[PDB]
């Protein structure tokens, strides 16, 4: 089985689990980031992370509202704050570990990894430097950082961009590529988050009784905010990310204003899941199924072709990443030692990551209270010491026999649980 690991912010170097990293992608970064694996290819650079040019985290001027935000510049800030972030991820992988498909779920992402190139990768080649796929690792000697090398991390998990309560997966190419992750081969994801600042909701999946009164609000779980980001990982790393461009207008309503509309994205409805997937036109979603085929076809047909490798040093290699890669998509081997696609390994495979890897299934799975629906409308959002077992453990996460919350998920009320404060109303927008 898998086993996460334990850090202290201060914890030395050890040139394996715990170094320095220059991903050259986060603009508030002027030196190398102190990063540690949780398990396998999963890392966290406890963060705060941006792509905007002349970063600023201070709540913005203008109004990119009706959004629901948290602005808070200092959050991060110091080696103490980091600490406790990265405790709090490390305690979630914990508690998302405890159920089996958590457990499918973080050894997939810590294990699978990108085809090693992108569309404009030579057929015959296996490219581990690909767009943003390898990150460079450096130590420092003297009054400087010199690169000593690099690994190729599938997922990195970073504190929150300028917005805290609007946490976002993201992969990254070079100008004159697209998307790897929208076409089989999948790609580094980045995701920056904080969990501990939870969304606030009273249109939620278990009824509790109030329906012919007034319905109580609840938080979602911490570990629902990370697993959605850790679907949206799901869906880049193996190649069938949806353009962000496709999608539904739909209406919501923030922790302030009222019913607005928004452009509710297709791939925001495969990593929420449920009867929600059923607003993609059926013709819509068998077509962008179709499309993750042809996308692995092509896949398939490079692997039969690979004779090369970037770096050199992978040349000897090529056998070893060819097998690791055929496992990934499960394609079959024929009896000549030609790799091909078979259409329902495939089929079973795309079900899993779009349709039973979901927030949705994760509620039920983990037993735990949650939105009904994506855009349910939202409150003030709340926060806790999920460090506390006293207030959030593995187990049981809010909802604690011992402090008599384990009934009708009183633990994730709100007017029942003391534990959940709103969050400080300042940097609210
Ligand atoms: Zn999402």
Redesign the pocket.
Known sequence: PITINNFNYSDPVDNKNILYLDTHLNTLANEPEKAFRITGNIWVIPDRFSRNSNPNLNKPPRVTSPKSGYYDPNYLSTDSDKDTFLKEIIKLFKRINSREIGEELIYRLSTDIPFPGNNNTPINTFDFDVDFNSVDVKTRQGNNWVKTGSINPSVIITGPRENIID?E?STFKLTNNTFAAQEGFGALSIISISPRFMLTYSNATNDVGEGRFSKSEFCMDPILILM??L??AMHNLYGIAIPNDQTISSVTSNIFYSQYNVKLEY??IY??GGPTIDLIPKSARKYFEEKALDYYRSIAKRLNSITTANPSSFNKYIGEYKQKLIRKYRFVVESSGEVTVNRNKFVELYNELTQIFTEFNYAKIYNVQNRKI?LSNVYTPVTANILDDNVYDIQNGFNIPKSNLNVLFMGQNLSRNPALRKVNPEPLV
């Open positions: 946490p997966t959605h980001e679907n949206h791939a925001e990593a929420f994506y």
